[PDB]
Amino acid sequence: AVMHFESFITEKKQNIQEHLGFLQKLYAAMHEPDGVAGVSAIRKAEPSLKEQILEHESLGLLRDATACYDRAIQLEPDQIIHYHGVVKSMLGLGQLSTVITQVNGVHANRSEWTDELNTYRVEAAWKLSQWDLVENYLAADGKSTTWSVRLGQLLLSAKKRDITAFYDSLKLVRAEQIVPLSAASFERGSYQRGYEYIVRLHMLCELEHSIKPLFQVARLEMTQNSYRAKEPILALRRALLSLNKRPDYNEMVGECWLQSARVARKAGHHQTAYNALLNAGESRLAELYVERAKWLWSKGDVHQALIVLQKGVELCFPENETPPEGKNMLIHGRAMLLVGRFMEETANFESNAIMKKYKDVTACLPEWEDGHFYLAKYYDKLMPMVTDNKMEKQGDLIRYIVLHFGRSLQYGNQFIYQSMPRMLTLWLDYGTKAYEWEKAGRSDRVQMRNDLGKINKVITEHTNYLAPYQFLTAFSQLISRI
Amino acid sequence: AVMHFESFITEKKQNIQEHLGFLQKLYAAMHEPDGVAGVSAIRKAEPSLKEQILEHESLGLLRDATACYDRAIQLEPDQIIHYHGVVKSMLGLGQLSTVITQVNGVHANRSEWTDELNTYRVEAAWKLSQWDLVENYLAADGKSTTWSVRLGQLLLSAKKRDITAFYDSLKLVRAEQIVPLSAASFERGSYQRGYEYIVRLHMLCELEHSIKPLFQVARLEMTQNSYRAKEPILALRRALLSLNKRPDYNEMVGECWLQSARVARKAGHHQTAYNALLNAGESRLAELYVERAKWLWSKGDVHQALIVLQKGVELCFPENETPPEGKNMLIHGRAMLLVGRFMEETANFESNAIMKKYKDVTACLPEWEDGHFYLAKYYDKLMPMVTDNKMEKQGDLIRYIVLHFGRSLQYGNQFIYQSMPRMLTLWLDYGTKAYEWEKAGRSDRVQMRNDLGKINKVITEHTNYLAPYQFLTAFSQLISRICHSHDEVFVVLMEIIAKVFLAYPQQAMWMMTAVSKSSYPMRVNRCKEILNKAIHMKKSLEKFVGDATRLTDKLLELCNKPVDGHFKMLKKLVEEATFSEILIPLQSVMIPTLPSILGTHANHASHEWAYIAGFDDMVEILASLQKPKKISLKGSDGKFYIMMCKPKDDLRKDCRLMEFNSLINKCLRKDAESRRRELHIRTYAVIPLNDECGIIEWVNNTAGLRPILTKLYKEKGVYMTGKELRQCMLPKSAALSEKLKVFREFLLPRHPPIFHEWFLRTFPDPTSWYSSRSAYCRSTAVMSMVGYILGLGDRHGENILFDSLTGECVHVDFNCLFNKGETFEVPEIVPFRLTHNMVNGMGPMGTEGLFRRACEVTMRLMRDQREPLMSVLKTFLHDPLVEWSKLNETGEVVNEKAKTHVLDIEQRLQGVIKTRNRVTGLPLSIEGHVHYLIQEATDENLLCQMYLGWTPYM
């Protein structure tokens, strides 16, 4: 189509806003969401039912989704699609038990069909503890099939064990879901298009390597291991992550209710980036009391992403709930009790908390851990913020007191990386060309030559701490300053 | 309960976060939402479903509502409230035709009932085009005890006309709104709690006064004309505004369907302010395509509101769907099809559309319009950007180009005004001095006098056009630079202020007085000229001209008698008591203060109030180591008004603040976050007479803080050793660490909770106690912040009075201004007085209760209106008849630190504090900026370094 479509527009140039609204559909069902946003860049009517729905499924926004679908019901009866995208948007905010109330309000009209029972009411308590409807709304069972739907029967067959029929039900659908990625396989990101179904595939082995120890032994391929190598679009990764939660509820003690909440965090860990922001509104709220420190920690990251940093900062002092004032012997709980004390260093932004405070606290944190990447890289950069507006640039004692902490941090690190060993080798040569003009026309070399030697003690350490593989990036710059 | 709650903390300290969870109930049903957030700001678990719901349903931020509900279902059954609260938010985001489905889900489930049929599912198509379920969902009908539900009975019956039940079900429900407001009407401004049911009154009547043609000929009580009457809160308005959508389709062609959009337009008109931002997503779409120019305008306003100003500007060129380039003759569209052409005002401050295009595209529009009050008022402000951006400040022909569009603009206008007549006269008079700086020693005198002479011509033109009514607003500032030594400037100012003083001179009798009688003779010799050419056309007015002088001559001798060793009118003020045939108005802080006008009624200018009519009996005379004097005046209508002679310093300072607070109080009136809290600064007029002094409007029912700090505190004993109480209080070189200790060792003498108990022991119980505290916070926090942004200092224990009845806060002694309290001997670095005693009045969990939330609205409405507030204070910074007490001939120079002080309010109302050193800019948020400046009170680190005559220990 689009081969011949925009070829048509170049010869006999019947310009586009006449021939316009068809062209969305070409971009639409291809799922080429970049193009659909390009449509409204040129459209000079912005008029209609379909088109103003059709852009919104490409916008990625899901706040005002329900409004646009409400406008269809203002103008139309059922016509499945419109109601069908309502509950999507309800699931866009993840609104399970309300969708359970939204269930029968189609079938007190039986509004042309059963299909929305057959799609998300088939679901809703899929993503919830309940199964009762999900058992029973699976009644048509052939006019039901979607990604979730036969997938629905898996956990019903996990709540009704049926060892042959369970393994049948994997081998029922697992191949059938590859048929969409079994398209004409061109290496132009053949993997890339791909990826939703690949992740959809990636679900299913994480059933098998997890359900077996409840079912008859395979312990490993734990429910978070492979996660750390995934694409954080998170319009995509959520399709893991809720379904990643409940096998720990389909499993048991071992404290189910810890990790169910702990996975429900990581919804928000990648809802703060890649926004779709309003469904963070349950990312906080998909928890009860488990591990308040990390839970209130990411609750700051709504605020740090959204607007108000003080409501971040203030709500980063029911940090003080999580254990205050000694008693600290909680090393793993410590290991992110202190990470929250690095995102009290938000309010470098919100100034007038005093200079020395963060200079206390984010120096009170490298008391603790001394590997553990997150310590000093901030505690570096806050200092040369000040050394700018300090004395410039002869008495620079804190050259020394900084360049521990690129090094002696990256000692323990490898990761928040690329900026720093520039600055380490920069401040070593920000060091320099004061000196030859202290050598030429000054005599304030008194401490500074010695302080260079103080710096020179620090280099030799970490150039024998750090493997030179991790010197390799700014190694080019080392060739510069021969 | 609340009366007996904070009392329960003071004695018998059940500590707060222990007993805290009960207390949020007490704000909840009482619709006292500002309690809840601060109370939740002390609780450390945020534990329940319901309390977080109670947090949520108080604040009413409705976008994230269903998340609170969805977990609440996931622990619970029906328990009606939760599902009952779901559909609130559903109608809260107006998701109506989805609620229609969301009705019928509970029929099959029966989550304990199907009673929520009767609650909201009654409505759903109460807005929407159906009514047929509404026919059917009327099934319980004794279980219909709800506002809209019984209201829902009407339009079913109103289409099937039902002449009997038409009026009768009104006077059913007409009573059924009043029975709650028929609570016993305690007159503390009860009207405002109030207001929803009064809105609910105004709901009904536009049905009744418009069904009449189809009910059986008129259709009056015009729905859009009555629409200007109410608050733009929109959390209260929209229920009317939805109802104003409703009978539009009942009436018909005549283009019904204009209004269905245009009320949906005026839905989303008031939704940019007072957010409910995503609910405006429906406002954008609860519409038709009617008048797409006026529609495509509106969508960018959310984007001027929400985040991105680009997209609206990008959406401002499908504006050119609606016709550019021909087809221009669309006069009724040209009412608003050009308004959007202004509303690339948005595009002004996302830079880089080039300068002259904005100079084009704006200044196109009066040449499209010429009336149209907003005409150059935006085009105004681009020009003084360019002036400092040009040569500073010699060759400024744009001054001439500006002030047309100051002036000739405003003959069209009435309203968006207050910012300009400053700048009219300011950049007139800020022209002026540089011309004598050419007449000092420069060479462009041949140009610039004629250029000023051109500028001088621009003035007198529009003053003949404009009524003096608009000049009355800036009238003190018009007085403020009479000491032009310049050529025609004063000569125009003669014919300015004459034509001002020709009308409404009675208020302006007073303001001549303080400059007419100052030592400062260059004023005074010039002052009596200013009378004369005005006197030249007064003839009837000229007695009161003589009389007011002859008043104030005796009123000097008020403050020039008190050498006396309690004395009388009848002893010495017999001259005053001799009083025949003089009517002069009694200073009436309401009525020198100038309500402006909307609505194209040119001009009529009116105020709404009395003359002297004798005096009181005698003068009670305070000592205060100064001998001031309680003098009443008895008024025309028997209302005794009580005045103070004062033997102190200048009051011309304090004059302008009484302008200024009222100007704020105007804007505090116009927005109603303030009015839901009912806050105002108590103004009271101070009319100076000399640079010695003039007169204070005393307020009765009043007592200072230190005498309140005596009384019950005496009953528990006042530590009265004085300088022995101030033993270790050395100068600065003594350690604040030590000064902590002497404070902390003698904190334990000074007990807090009396301020709660004063607020008990002199007060009756039932509820009059309560709103008195809702005064007491919301009083103090405003003039806290207003005092902060005006940097006032030295709020003494005798500087702050309170009503015996309402307990509103009262601020006197406005001498210790901007950073004079930081220029001071012991420099006050405390931003405003709020000691621990000031806390414990609005006591335990008043601590940061309403007061924070009150303080939010202040700064918000401050940082809303920067510039229409701002440069009043520039005139106040550049009023040269002001202190610097310090005599000479060439008086009234300049507050030389003004240009510094110009900054010293700008960043504070940019939300940028002093640039705590070696750090950047980064403006705070408002709800940010408050909490920092709150702890600036309880900075005992700072507070022990405070001057002790100010009594921070108190």
From Swiss-Prot, chain B:
UniProt-reported outcome of changing T322A: Impaired autophosphorylation, leading to decreased activation of ATR
Family: Belongs to the PI3/PI4-kinase family. ATM subfamily.
Record-annotated FATC domain positions: 922-954
Post-translational modification: Phosphorylated. Autophosphorylation at Thr-322 in response to DNA damage promotes interaction with TOPBP1 and activation of ATR.
Effect the entry attributes to changing E757K: In a breast pleomorphic lobular carcinoma sample; somatic mutation
Protein name, UniProt field: Serine/threonine-protein kinase ATR
FAT domain mapped to chain residues: 1-518
Subunit-level organization: Forms a heterodimer with ATRIP, forming the ATR-ATRIP complex. Present in a complex containing ATRIP and RPA-coated single-stranded DNA. Binds to DNA, and to UV-damaged DNA with higher affinity. Interacts with MSH2 and HDAC2. Present in a complex containing CHD4 and HDAC2. Interacts with EEF1E1, the interaction is enhanced by UV irradiation. Interacts with CLSPN and CEP164. Interacts with TELO2 and TTI1. Interacts with BCR-ABL after genotoxic stress. Interacts with UHRF2; this interaction promotes ATR activation.
Region feature (Activation loop): 811-835
Locations listed in the record: Nucleus; Chromosome; Nucleus envelope
Domain PI3K/PI4K catalytic: 615-914
Region (Catalytic loop): 791-799
Summary of the function given for this chain in its UniProt record: Serine/threonine protein kinase which activates checkpoint signaling upon genotoxic stresses such as ionizing radiation (IR), ultraviolet light (UV), or DNA replication stalling, thereby acting as a DNA damage sensor. Recognizes the substrate consensus sequence [ST]-Q. Phosphorylates BRCA1, CHEK1, MCM2, RAD17, RBBP8, RPA2, SMC1 and p53/TP53, which collectively inhibit DNA replication and mitosis and promote DNA repair, recombination and apoptosis. Phosphorylates 'Ser-139' of histone variant H2AX at sites of DNA damage, thereby regulating DNA damage response mechanism.
Lineage top rank: taxon: Eukaryota
Phosphothreonine modifications at: T322
Residue span relative to the full protein: 1654 to 2644 of 2644
Phenotype for A335G: In a lung adenocarcinoma sample; somatic mutation
Disease note: Seckel syndrome 1: A rare autosomal recessive disorder characterized by proportionate dwarfism of prenatal onset associated with low birth weight, growth retardation, severe microcephaly with a bird-headed like appearance, and intellectual disability.
Annotated organism of origin: Homo sapiens
Tissue specificity as recorded in UniProt: Ubiquitous, with highest expression in testis.
Chain residue ranges for the region called G-loop: 621-627
